[PDB]
Amino acid sequence: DDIFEFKCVDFGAYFIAMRLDKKTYLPQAIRRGTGDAWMVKKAAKVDPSAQQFCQYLIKHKSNNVITCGNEMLNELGYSGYFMSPHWCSDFSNME
């Protein structure tokens, strides 16, 4: 419910566990290792198994996260903005 706490957001083809950073209000996602957001792919338009794994990620892997903007730029080489279909491009860049 809290937008500053992770929730499994349905992006259509996949779930991402995301929230807003308390300090910057920038979108943040549970990160897949050293890469980008951990996308949990959905086998159908309704997929409770994909949702369950995403909830498991919130339970156990919420301490490795990636944030849109300057952090993603430094970490991955791109901001996430102005590059749909990247998940960051569905949100505000808070400029």
**Rounded alpha-carbon distances, angstroms, from residue 73 to 11, 13, 27, 82:** 22, 25, 14, 13
* Residue 55 φ/ψ, nearest 5 degrees: -65, -35
85 Cβ contact partners less than 8 Å away, ≥ 6 residues apart: none
Domain boundaries, the chain: 7-90
Q: Is the N-terminal amide bond of 27 cis, ω within 30° of 0?
A: no
Using left for φ > 0, alpha for ψ between -120 and 50, and beta otherwise, residue 84 falls in beta
